[PDB]
A paper describes a structure:
S. aureus encodes a 2,271-residue SRRP termed serine-rich adhesin for binding to platelets (SraP), that is involved in the pathogenesis of infective endocarditis. S. aureus SraP, a surface-exposed serine-rich repeat glycoprotein (SRRP), is required for the pathogenesis of human infective endocarditis via its ligand-binding region (BR) adhering to human platelets. We determine the 2.05 Å crystal structure of SraPBR, revealing a rod-like tandem organization of four discrete modules: a legume lectin-like module, a module with a β-grasp fold, and two tandem cadherin-like modules that create the rigid stem of SraPBR. Further structural and biochemical analyses reveal that the legume lectin-like module specifically binds to N-acetylneuraminic acid (Neu5Ac), which may mediate adhesion to host sialylated receptors.
Residue numbers in the entry: 495 to 663
Amino acid sequence: AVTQVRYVDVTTGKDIIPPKTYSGNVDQVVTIDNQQSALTAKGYNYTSVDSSYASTYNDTNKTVKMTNAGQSVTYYFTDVKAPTVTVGNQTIEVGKTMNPIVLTTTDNGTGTVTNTVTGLPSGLSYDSATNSIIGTPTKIGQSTVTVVSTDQANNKSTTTFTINVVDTT
Ligand SMILES: [Ca+2]
C-alpha cells in the first residue's frame, strides 16, 4: 500500500526534486502532488505523466487508490529557460598575454551547457575546456564578441560584449 512518485527532468532523466512516497490503507484514495508550482520556479514546465505502473491513477483528480501491490507515478518536466552567460566589456593591452576572460555561465537544468563563441580579436581564442577566452591580442581596435549558450534541452541565449585592445602610446 505505497505509491512512489518521481519528478523528472525529461532531458536527463534526473530527479529535479527528491522522489516522494505516499502510503495509505488498502482501498484508500490518496491525493498526490505534482509540484507544478515549485518546478515552474525552477524554470520547468510540466509536460507529461506516466502512470503505466499505477493503474488506479486518476489524472484529473491527482489521486491513487492504494493496493496491496506497489504503484509508481512519474511526472515529467521540461527545462524551458535558457542558460545565463554574464560577461561585461573588456579592455586589454596589445601584444601582452592576457589574463583569461572567464565566460561565467549558469543554468537552471540538470544537463550540459555548451557555449559558442565568435567574433574574437586577432590573437584571441575560446578555450572551451576552461570556458574562457585566452590569447595575446595582436592589433589595436574594438571587437564585438558573440556568445551563444545552449543547454541540453536546446534552450538558447545570446549575449555580446566588446573587447577593446589598447596601446600605451
Ligand atoms: Ca535551462
